[PDB]
Write a protein that binds this ligand. Structure first.
Ligand code: PLP
Ligand code: PLP
Ligand code: CL
Ligand code: CL
Lengths: 462, 472
């Protein structure tokens, strides 16, 4: 039997759990609940192997920025695969797709971020960052500058390096992690960690932790601060207005590289080409992936400022991947950016859908179960809480209420994910206002069903 | 901002060096000589932006196994990209391409290798292996088993972990590497490191370093031994006949996982589906990429054995990449595997081209510059030497002669690379006998030119200490 969309879902699910190990999963869970089989997608809508139509408020995995079914990219890939499906960039060799895409990326990246080292993923781009930066500081005559400073509940990939830069304890527990010279300061999540400080003062305190970490560890030991402009996988944590201005102040004062992990935030997600632009900072390096190709072809990379590139360009840089700059991926990514740029999809975000989504998403704070509704551009979160006044957590294991809401969302044909007891959305940037209404309608029904179930099941308390 | 094939080569090269940071390079010597722009390819032939045609004896980067120009992979990618160009396998969700690819890999991987964890590259596959294997020994109640044992001059990728697991000193010197709990033993390269030992004695000694390492580190600390069946990037080092059987028997003595890095050797390269079949080992995990999709789309992974997958299957495995199982990459890899299987390309290697290429390649040992010619399946190397009898290296820094030979190759429209003073080839598996003939004629002319050049440069010499040792 050939394995196609024509096989019964149950049969496909058996083959799935028998041979395909899923990311971030307990694989045995698939014996009880088989994996949902997505077979097609168009616009913002997915269809599963039973014909159900799900609104994908997560855009695949924060990445399908131009939405599904844009055929220009499939035409661009086929044409590239026919002419030159692959050649390497190792042999003093190059091709037009990576040349074109590198010039395009330099143009879009603000300031002197004008050079791209290519990777397959956001994880591999942050491996590049670790190796590039340490080599950079040695080449500058300061090889003791090795420490990357990150944050608890940051997420920077799933390689050995990526997982170590992220701040997920569960990830650190697997692989003898973190790798040496990776440190973590606290995250600017006011709702859960703010105490009774104002958001504004809490944002200052959390930013100041970078200067204290520098002084504690020694400036001669610190290589870089790496951070998501807005934490994505941590639960769409929007920092207070005070946070990034004080980070920038600290980075301006001390000899440290600022690494904006733009893997989720890049390419329109926050209303600008880069989250760095939105929050007002000036990184020396940006990690990119995901929205770079709207997820249609695997590709990521590091955009690097002139000064770092110049110093390393005088050295043999012994790093890189067989698929670095893969011509087809580059051709797909370039068409993605043309479609975002020339159809003004970022304008569509800034002026049309994001203001509408904001008004609707922030009104969910009116729901009894929702203590706060945070959103920038097209990434948003809601904290579910048993007490809005105390901002308290539920008594149950953090994520029990989130999981119930998540299940109610999917059962109501909407892709909204939980991180603990926050729910998160990251819909395609081409989403229209009428589509926002459906999202809000289904999110509200799922939130009501979670409320009643929690009440009935005795889980509404702190 | 319109950059296309129509632009002059000189202009394209200026944009390249200005914005494109090349892997494994000194970016600045692109200011000296700009990059060769490859514009198209078909079969085994590259064309560059000036119309020059190059026989690609390296198959892109050890990966274009079905050769260039297979428009089926484009049709499959396009059709997958219109139907479902991306979905994630993170949300208790899946899709048909990753399901079918996994079932095909489980059927092709011998024995109980029946489970695939997907990556984007061979490097990410090895990051998976480190996190998976350490987590597995911890799940088994033995958390102290963390040390990956690897080899010098091994190559296992370029992530923090891939670079660490490889054995390239220049790679260790960038990133504060190797990361902890990685140990390196010596490599089975008899030509350069054999001393006065016979090859098969040397083979046993080199494999015995694995037990020596295990015993000096402690069985309670060791988690895995990882190794390429045949070292590729280190210069296609074919171990002596004794080497892999002893490794295997050492691994069967100890609680240790054998990981075969099949990123190069996999999918026909050595005359079998996997280099482990050819060298006769039973790995617990195989790392895959390159030939998996014939490089037409980026994808990698780890093929995992039943007992390791099942141990982990009972735990939340907090690992994975957005593009793990990417539906277009899978569809392409599947079609690649279909073509390899249904057109019997491995049979074409085994019975037609590999024996012909072996005959002709090993005859290169008759060349006055060549000291040895080693080939398994469709990967080969030759050692360039000033003295065949002693195997003594050139007096000039290692790679001086290899580099000169590489240049004569590219001047003869042949992609033959050097690793130190070895030349290496890894041609597309669908290479025909007439294409072998062109390869060898070009390779032989490049050997001839190299030979008379270094002779004129006064570089055809071992060290004066090695020349005196010619006193027999
Ligand atoms: C998704 C994520 C990554 C991981 O990139 P992969 O392609 O999954 O390896 C890295 N950084 C950030 C900020 C991410 O959100
Ligand atoms: C090429 C190589 C790798 C790395 O694969 P990438 O796709 O470049 O990350 C790993 N192992 C071996 C043996 C390799 O040759
Ligand atoms: Cl929270
Ligand atoms: Cl040698």
């Amino acid at each position: 039997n050939a394995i196609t969309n024509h096989l019964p879902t149950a049969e496909l699910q058996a083959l799935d759990v028998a041979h395909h190990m899923h990311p971030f999963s307990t694989q045995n869970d698939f014996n009880d609940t088989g994996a949902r089989v997505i077979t097609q997608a168009k616009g913002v809508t997915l269809t599963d192997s039973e014909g159900a139509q799900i609104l994908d408020a997560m855009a695949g995995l924060w990445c399908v920025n131009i939405g599904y079914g844009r055929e220009e990219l499939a035409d661009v890939a086929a044409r590239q695969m026919r002419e030159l499906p692959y050649y390497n960039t190792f042999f003093k060799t190059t091709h037009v797709p990576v040349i074109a895409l590198s010039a395009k990326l330099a143009e879009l990246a603000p300031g002197d971020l004008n050079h791209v080292f290519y990777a397959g993923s956001g994880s591999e781009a942050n491996d590049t960052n670790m190796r590039l930066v340490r080599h950079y500081w040695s080449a500058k005559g300061k090889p003791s500058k090795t420490i990357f400073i990150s944050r608890k509940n940051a997420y920077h990939g799933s390689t050995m390096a990526g997982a170590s830069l992220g701040g997920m304890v569960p990830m650190h527990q697997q692989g003898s992690l973190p790798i040496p010279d990776v440190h973590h300061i606290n995250q600017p999540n006011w709702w859960a960690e703010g105490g009774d400080m104002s958001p504004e003062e809490f944002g200052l305190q959390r930013a100041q932790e970078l200067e204290e970490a520098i002084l504690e560890l020694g400036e001669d030991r610190v290589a870089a601060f790496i951070a998501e402009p807005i934490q994505g996988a941590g639960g769409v944590i929007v920092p207070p207005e005070t946070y990034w201005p004080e980070i920038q102040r600290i980075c301006d004062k001390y000899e440290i590289l600022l690494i904006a992990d733009e893997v989720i935030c890049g390419f329109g997600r926050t209303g600008n080409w880069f989250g760095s632009q939105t929050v007002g900072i000036k990184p020396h390096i940006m990690s990119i992936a995901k929205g770079l190709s709207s997820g249609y072809a695997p590709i990521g990379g590091s955009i690097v400022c002139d000064e770092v590139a110049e110093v390393v360009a005088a050295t043999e840089f012994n790093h890189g991947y067989t698929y670095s700059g893969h011509p087809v991926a580059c051709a797909v990514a370039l068409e993605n950016l043309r479609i975002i740029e020339e159809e003004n999809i970022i304008g569509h975000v800034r002026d049309d859908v994001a203001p509408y989504l904001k008004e609707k998403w922030e009104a969910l704070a009116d729901h009894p179960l929702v203590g706060e509704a945070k959103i920038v551009g097209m990434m948003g979160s809601i904290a579910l809480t048993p007490n809005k006044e105390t901002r308290a957590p539920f008594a149950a294991d953090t994520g029990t209420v989130g999981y119930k809401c998540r299940e109610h969302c999917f059962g109501n044909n909407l892709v909204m994910r939980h991180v603990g007891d926050r729910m998160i959305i990251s819909p395609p940037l081409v989403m229209t206002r009428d589509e926002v209404d459906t999202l809000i309608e289904r999110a509200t029904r799922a939130l009501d069903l979670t409320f009643e179930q929690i009440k009935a099941e005795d889980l509404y308390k702190s």
